Amino acid sequence: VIRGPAGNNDCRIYVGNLPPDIRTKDIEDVFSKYGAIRDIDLKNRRGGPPFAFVEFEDPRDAEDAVSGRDGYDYDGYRLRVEFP
RNA sequence: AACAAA
């Protein structure tokens, strides 16, 4: 199946509508408080639109981070935090 | 849904 790096675990979810000031450490701070993220997978790389993946400690903690940050009213946009 | 750009 299609995947990012060697993070083949099912603990992964998707993230989008990243703010103009997103930072790699922000997933290790906020999302780590929500589920102790094991791995980051930013894909702001060229050749397509910026987006990212996130790999949780377990599928159970990912539900709390999704319910706490998904579909959030932002300036002119709305945060995306849900699984594929 | 800013969904593999490994």
UniProtKB/Swiss-Prot annotation:
Location in or out of the cell: Cytoplasm; Nucleus speckle
This protein's name: Serine/arginine-rich splicing factor 1
Impact reported for P84S: In a breast cancer sample; somatic mutation
Modification after translation: Phosphorylated by CLK1, CLK2, CLK3 and CLK4. Phosphorylated by SRPK1 at multiple serines in its RS domain via a directional (C-terminal to N-terminal) and a dual-track mechanism incorporating both processive phosphorylation (in which the kinase stays attached to the substrate after each round of phosphorylation) and distributive phosphorylation steps (in which the kinase and substrate dissociate after each phosphorylation event).
Residue ranges of every copy of the RRM domain listed in the record: 11-84
Phenotypic consequence of G35V: In NEDFBA; likely pathogenic
Outcome, altering D39N: In NEDFBA; uncertain significance
High-level lineage: Eukaryota, Metazoa, Chordata, Craniata, Vertebrata
Assembly and interaction partners: Consists of two polypeptides of p32 and p33. Identified in the spliceosome C complex. Component of a ribonucleoprotein complex containing mRNAs and RNA-binding proteins including DDX5, HNRNPH2 and SRSF1 as well as splicing regulator ARVCF. In vitro, self-associates and binds SRSF2, SNRNP70 and U2AF1 but not U2AF2. Binds SREK1/SFRS12. Interacts with SAFB/SAFB1. Interacts with PSIP1/LEDGF. Interacts with RSRC1 (via Arg/Ser-rich domain). Interacts with ZRSR2/U2AF1-RS2. Interacts with CCDC55 (via C-terminus).
Domain topic, free-text comment: The RRM 2 domain plays an important role in governing both the binding mode and the phosphorylation mechanism of the RS domain by SRPK1. RS domain and RRM 2 are uniquely positioned to initiate a highly directional (C-terminus to N-terminus) phosphorylation reaction in which the RS domain slides through an extended electronegative channel separating the docking groove of SRPK1 and the active site. RRM 2 binds toward the periphery of the active site and guides the directional phosphorylation mechanism. Both the RS domain and an RRM domain are required for nucleocytoplasmic shuttling.
Gene that this polypeptide is encoded by: SRSF1
Residue numbers of N6-acetyllysine PTMs: K33
Glycyl lysine isopeptide (Lys-Gly) (interchain with G-Cter in SUMO2) crosslink site(s): K25, K33
